[PDB]
Design a protein around this ligand. Sequence first.
Ligand SMILES: Nc1ncnc2c1ncn2[C@@H]1O[C@H](COP(=O)(O)OP(=O)(O)OP(O)(O)=S)[C@@H](O)[C@H]1O
Ligand SMILES: [Mg+2]
Lengths: 37, 160, 350, 134
Amino acid sequence: SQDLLERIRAKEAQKQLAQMTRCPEQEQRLQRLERLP
Amino acid sequence: CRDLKELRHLAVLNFPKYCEPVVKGRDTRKLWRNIEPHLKKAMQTVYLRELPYYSKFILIAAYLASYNPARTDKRFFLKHHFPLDRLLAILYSIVDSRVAPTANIFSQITSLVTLQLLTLVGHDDQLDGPKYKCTVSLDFIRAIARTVNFDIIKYLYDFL
Amino acid sequence: VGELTDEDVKMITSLSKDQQIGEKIFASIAPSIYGHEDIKRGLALALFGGEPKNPGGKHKVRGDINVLLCGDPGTAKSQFLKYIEKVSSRAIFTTGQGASAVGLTAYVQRHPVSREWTLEAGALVLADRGVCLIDEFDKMNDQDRTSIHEAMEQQSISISKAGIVTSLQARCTVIAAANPIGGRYDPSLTFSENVDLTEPIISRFDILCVVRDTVDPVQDEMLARFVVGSHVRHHPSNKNTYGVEPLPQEVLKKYIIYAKERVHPKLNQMDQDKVAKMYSDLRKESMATTVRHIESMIRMAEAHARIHLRDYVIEDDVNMAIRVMLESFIDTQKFSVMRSMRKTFARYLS
Amino acid sequence: TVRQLESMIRLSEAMARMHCCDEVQPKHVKEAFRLLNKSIIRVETPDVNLRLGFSEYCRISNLIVLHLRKVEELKRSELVNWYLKEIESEIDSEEELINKKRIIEKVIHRLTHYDHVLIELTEDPYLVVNPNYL
Ligand SMILES: Nc1ncnc2c1ncn2[C@@H]1O[C@H](COP(=O)(O)OP(=O)(O)OP(O)(O)=S)[C@@H](O)[C@H]1O
Ligand SMILES: [Mg+2]
């Protein structure tokens, strides 16, 4: 059913949001680290 | 149509065709599909329920005289650059053949006046300077022009 | 002529013996443009050119055809001019705004180093023996127009400036483009009234072609189909009315060169009575509304004979020249009289 | 004139380049047709009674009429189910689903009872298109 798929997608989105609760600056410095040399 | 009488009259008129399909053999889709085009044909009329040769030329000339300002007359007819005389000049210009001023054309003018296609404006006693107006719809004059092989749109100043 | 390969000559001769050579020649011009047979016909006929003559060394009869093109916007006149620019072996393109009288003609100048009077050739002078294209000729200043008539009529320019008098040849084919005043051509007015040019300038022109815009659904279908097909064909990644296959561009160019440089027709089988009667009728129907028209028709017949690579002119050339000239003339008249003109001259148009 | 046709082809090519698609699709043509048509344009369209935009209202009406006319060669619940199936690519939360249900119910009722473009035939009534909508 569509409801089951949407709830699964919402659960995945919530899990990924909890994953990205980490500070965005952590990856921004990593991005800059490749540009430094 | 919100008129109860008119809607009831329409229902009375159209009911037999409503009941034909079931007689031919509660099928809502079947009835609607069989009946839809007739309804569209009926809605075309909600509230509604061959001239002689020279007469056509007279009519088109009268229409041109009525709907074309006099200043542009020579611009449309003179080869190099409303009263009855203007109509006569325009008619002589339009027709490729020399038409004699037989009394029959005057009889045609008077008959066209009688048929409520041309309205007399001036006094009835004044039959030397009479005034006329044309009351023919544009679609009618376009249709009658087509049967003559004449393009009236090319001479209408307003459209240009 | 010396550079021509004998294979090119044999191909040209094999094309000449074809009975449908004219049809494929006309269809070979502007493949990317649809319809408009009359304009390409007239431009090709002018491109082939007539035979200039100098009877007795007293007066010189030009063998050049001047074409003026007035049309409603959206008919790809500039595309035709650009194609003519590319095809011609010698071609110069000028715009109306950027062409001054001093620029178009030769002018006297003092040399920056040695400081003697010197002549610098204009566009028309460099167009000698070639073709000159004028775009937006209706934009010409009247003062700039004044110098044009001399080169149009005599195909030579006499410069009398700063104590220097010189004569230079101006044998060129001139193609001029113009737009009607107000942006739309009025069929209820004479051709002279719709174009802001004096009568002598129009008289110098030999062929006049007017193009209008009409809303025809079938013609719209044809235009859309042809345009989208052309767009599909000419993609860089991917890189007729007469029913005849167009010729290759190089073959057409070689044919034009050979025809220009070999054929010299002779008008020894012309019936003067027919043309005399036609010219009398032309006078009758023009005063109701000249010699150079007859001269243009004569050089037109000469050019048409040159198309078929014939040393002598057959009367079919005269018939086609009469037909196209009459079509050009009636197109310049008012609507109220062109029907009567067509009825009167239905003998030749049929 | 033909210049506008060339502009239309250029607009289709620009839409194709925007989406990084190696081939041109008719969706680009449909998108560019509106922009060529609109000409005179207001600052902002007024709201329609929770409010919804006029362009979105026309979009929903066009989609529903096209589907009904295609099916002619339905039921209220079945059509709503189809719409929810088609709009699945955009909804990401339950609140959006209930909002879309509210919107579609309101739009269907409004078209049935105010614009008369949809005619009811006798809890799941049959819906038919007014035969004079193009
Ligand atoms: N009959 C036609 N067939 C094919 N393409 C055409 C045709 N008419 C116009 N076009 C296209 O339309 C484009 C623009 O036309 P233009 O040449 O600018 O119009 P125009 O008739 O020269 O009037 P102006 O000089 O621009 S005001 C051309 O480059 C062609 O690609
Ligand atoms: Mg142009």
